[PDB]
Amino acid sequence: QQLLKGLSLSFS
Amino acid sequence: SNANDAAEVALYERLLQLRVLPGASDVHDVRFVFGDDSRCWIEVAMHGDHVIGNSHPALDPKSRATLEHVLTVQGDLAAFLVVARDMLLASL
Amino acid sequence: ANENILKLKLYRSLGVILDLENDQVLINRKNDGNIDILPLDNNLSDFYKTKYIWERLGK
Numbered sequence: 001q002q003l004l005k006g007l008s009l010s011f012s
Numbered sequence: 013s014n015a016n017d018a019a020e021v022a023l024y025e026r027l028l029q030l031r032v033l034p035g036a037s038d039v040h041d042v043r044f045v046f047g048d049d050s051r052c053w054i055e056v057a058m059h060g061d062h063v064i065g066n067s068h069p070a071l072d073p074k075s076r077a078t079l080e081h082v083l084t085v086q087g088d089l090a091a092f093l094v095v096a097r098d099m100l101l102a103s104l
Numbered sequence: 105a106n107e108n109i110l111k112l113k114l115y116r117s118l119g120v121i122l123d124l125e126n127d128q129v130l131i132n133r134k135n136d137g138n139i140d141i142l143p144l145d146n147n148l149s150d151f152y153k154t155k156y157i158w159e160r161l162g163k
Contacts, residue, residue, distance in 0.1 A: 001084075003110065004058060007107065007110045007111070010107045011042065017108040024115040024120070024122070028158070030115075090161060093161075094161050
């Protein structure tokens with residue numbers, strides 16, 4: 001789950 | 013390096029025809045776009061209401077339920093992307 | 105473009121490994137010691153390469 005979490009934090 | 017990373021991403025995008033974009037509803041959602049031409053896409057939210065969000069070829073609840081289980085229970089992003097891609101391509 | 109690191113991790117998490125020193129792409133779907141090797145030095149179309157990769161990522 002941590003790869004999507006990192007992408008979401010970056011996109012945010 | 014930042015240059016080399018950008019070049020490798022472009023090649024992955026060309027090889028897989030898979031682009032990772034900010035979500036068009038919430039920018040912190042993740043939008044997976046399949047195809048040269050944005051023909052298919054699906055959005056996922058990390059810790060909101062819907063894990064599986066919108067998708068251009070909309071998907072039935074049975075299909076959406078399967079995708080959530082692959083993503084949340086199984087925690088297998090490749091598997092999720094494989095199933096989502098097949099499902100979306102088959103609803104065009 | 106700080107997002108590019110995370111994109112590369114996502115792509116690598118699929119088991120697709122760019123191996124440009126050898127002008128090829130590796131596909132590690134099972135982590136069982138077997139790989140699929142897709143050469144890039146050929147006349148294969150982009151469509152064919154994409155179809156192949158997803159075929160190997162599937163079942």
